Design a protein around this ligand. Structure first.
Ligand SMILES: NC(=S)Nc1ccccc1OC(F)(F)F
Ligand SMILES: [Cl-]
Ligand SMILES: [Zn+2]
Ligand SMILES: [Zn+2]
Length: 576
């Protein structure tokens, strides 16, 4: 309590001394409440006109158009403390898992240099973050806080709250987080090669092949249970097992990392905007509140831990969670040593998302440890057995499913897919306002190149991608605002990138013969394409395709007299 957060609280109070008020109508039961002060402020989603003008048939599909319009009673919930046997299972598994992750990696601090480059390449006292990073005063502020963290105290590391709640901090706090824990992401601790379960850095053109590799293992069904609000179910016991990564560290780094875990993760200060408009200063020990990048790595870690323990329960390694006998600890430790690495290779885990191919289907009803850790499954009754998948091509993972697609030359592509309304509806949205026509067109082109690389097998997305790349000046560079490896972010010719990604660099493709034209590159079956949302067969789509050069010319006239390429003859029906 207040020893560790008092300074932070004391400091906020005194910047708003003409405001402080201990409110008695504060809506917090689960968040500790401290006080309030005066404010008044809010970003919604704007439509990308280039993408929308080249996707006219979708103007009348509610699933597309509704996406561009428009439970916080989950953050104000509380998870019980796991039983003593659960806590032992978690501590033993966590200790073993950090050791395995650390075998071929060295923890290390990340630098002002690395941080500075990252804000400049794009990943109130100053305007943008770009500015603060050049001003040497900022870095004096960082040093002040840093020396405080070496003392075991904190002054400025305060969360600002905004199934999506986002906890921004001031850039200095993010730096200190990155300094201490950036190695997890920067040095690929959750890569598949290092962690066996992980997919960090793998890319959407790899995830399907990875699921197919898991399918080749002897075992039962594939299970893909989502957790209901994963970030809100992270226990103080989880935060303490995550902190054990500091056991692998040394000198100053060890102390900087311990200070991030103790002072910002296992104790938290948050400012929240309440309309009735005051800023509320609340605290709590548990739940997830790191930066999005550290959150991903620690989510992956704890998910790997929970899923190994669920697999232990299904194999009958332990009998009850209430208490672990001495021999049961010996059996758990010996299971980890003997088959831990084989059991990790049976999973694909991306933060809170997982796919497990267990040894057999006893896993489906092994629910005691999972429920007691507070990782309660979404949209199924607490004690109802999981429904597994019999076909890897139907398993959901990272918002996708995966098709097996045979090329006219017999080589096998495993391709990512989702409902086409979701893909078109997202490409029609721009984040933030103040965008020029040119910037809006370059965001359109980023989507079009992504579709050509990942979704080429969808007849409507190949045609719309060609139309957008034909309508945007040939040499304009694709742009974004929140950058999964992104090979579509380039001015290189998309056929050449396709060959690099799908043939040359694809470790599941033995024959390295380049593809010479887009017509060698196959589609889904026409019925599968319709099943996944295609408009092929509709009159609205036939008129769109047939008259596509008129939509292209409409966007060219708006942008003006620039150099354009016609990509439409890369498709058979337009090749005259
Ligand atoms: N990506 C996250 S969560 N933090 C971070 C790490 C390294 C550089 C910058 C970053 O902070 C910023 F994006 F807020 F600026
Ligand atoms: Cl199935
Ligand atoms: Zn601090
Ligand atoms: Zn599909």
């Amino acid at each position: 309590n207040l020893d560790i957060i008092g300074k932070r609280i004391e400091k906020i109070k005194q910047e708003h001394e003409t405001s402080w008020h201990y409110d008695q109508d504060h809506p917090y039961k689960t968040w500790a409440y401290h006080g309030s002060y005066e404010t008044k402020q809010t970003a919604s989603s704007m439509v990308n006109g280039v993408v929308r003008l080249l996707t006219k048939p979708w103007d009348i599909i509610p699933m597309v158009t509704q996406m561009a319009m428009t439970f916080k009673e989950k953050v104000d919930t509380r998870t019980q403390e796991p039983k003593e046997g659960t806590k032992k299972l978690m501590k033993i598994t966590a200790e073993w898992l950090w050791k395995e992750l650390g075998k071929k990696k060295t923890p290390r601090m990340c630098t002002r240099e690395e941080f500075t480059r990252k804000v400049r390449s794009n990943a109130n006292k100053w305007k943008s973050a770009r500015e603060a990073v050049e001003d040497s005063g900022f870095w004096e502020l960082v040093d002040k806080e840093r020396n405080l963290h070496l003392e075991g105290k904190c002054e400025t590391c305060v969360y600002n709250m905004m199934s999506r709640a986002i906890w921004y901090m001031w850039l200095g706090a993010r730096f200190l987080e990155f300094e201490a824990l950036g190695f997890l992401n920067e040095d690929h601790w959750f890569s598949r090669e290092n962690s066996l379960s992980g997919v960090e850095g793998e890319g959407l053109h790899k995830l399907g092949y990875i699921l197919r590799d898991v399918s080749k293992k002897e075992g039962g069904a594939m299970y893909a249970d989502d957790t209901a609000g994963w970030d809100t179910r992270i226990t103080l016991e989880d935060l303490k097992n995550e902190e054990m990564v500091t056991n692998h560290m040394e000198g100053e780094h060890k102390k900087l990392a311990e200070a991030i875990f103790k002072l910002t993760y296992q104790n938290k200060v948050v400012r929240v905007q309440r309309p009735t408009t005051v800023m509320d200063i609340i605290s709590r020990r548990d739940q997830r509140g790191s930066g999005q990048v550290v959150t991903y790595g620690l989510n992956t870690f704890t998910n790997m831990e929970a899923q190994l323990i669920r697999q232990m329960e299904g194999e009958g390694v332990f009998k009850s969670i209430q208490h672990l006998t001495v021999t049961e600890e010996i059996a758990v430790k010996n299971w980890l040593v003997r088959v831990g690495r084989e059991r990790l290779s049976r999973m694909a885990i991306s933060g809170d998302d997982c796919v497990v191919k267990p040894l057999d289907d006893r896993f489906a009803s092994a629910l005691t440890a999972l429920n007691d850790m507070g990782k309660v499954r979404k949209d199924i009754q607490q004690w109802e057995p999981s429904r597994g998948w019999n076909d890897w091509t139907q398993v959901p993972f990272c918002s996708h499913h995966f098709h097996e697609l045979i090329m006219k030359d017999g080589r096998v592509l495993v391709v990512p897919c989702r409902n086409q309304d979701e893909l078109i509806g997202r490409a029609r949205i721009s984040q933030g306002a103040g965008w020029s026509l040119r910037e809006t067109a370059c965001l359109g082109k980023s989507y079009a190149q992504m579709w050509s690389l990942m979704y080429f097998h969808r007849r409507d997305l190949r045609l719309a991608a060609n139309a957008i790349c034909s309508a945007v000046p040939s040499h304009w560079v694709p742009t974004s605002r929140t950058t999964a490896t992104h090979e579509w972010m380039t001015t290189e010719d998309m056929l050449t990138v396709w060959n690099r990604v799908w043939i040359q660099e694809n470790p599941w493709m033995e024959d390295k013969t380049p593809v010479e034209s887009w017509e060698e590159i196959p589609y889904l079956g026409k019925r599968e394409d319709q099943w996944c949302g295609s408009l092929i067969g509709l009159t609205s789509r036939a008129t769109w395709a047939k008259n596509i050069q008129t939509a292209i010319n409409q966007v060219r006239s708006l942008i003006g007299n620039e150099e354009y390429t016609d990509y439409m003859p890369s498709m058979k029906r337009f090749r005259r």
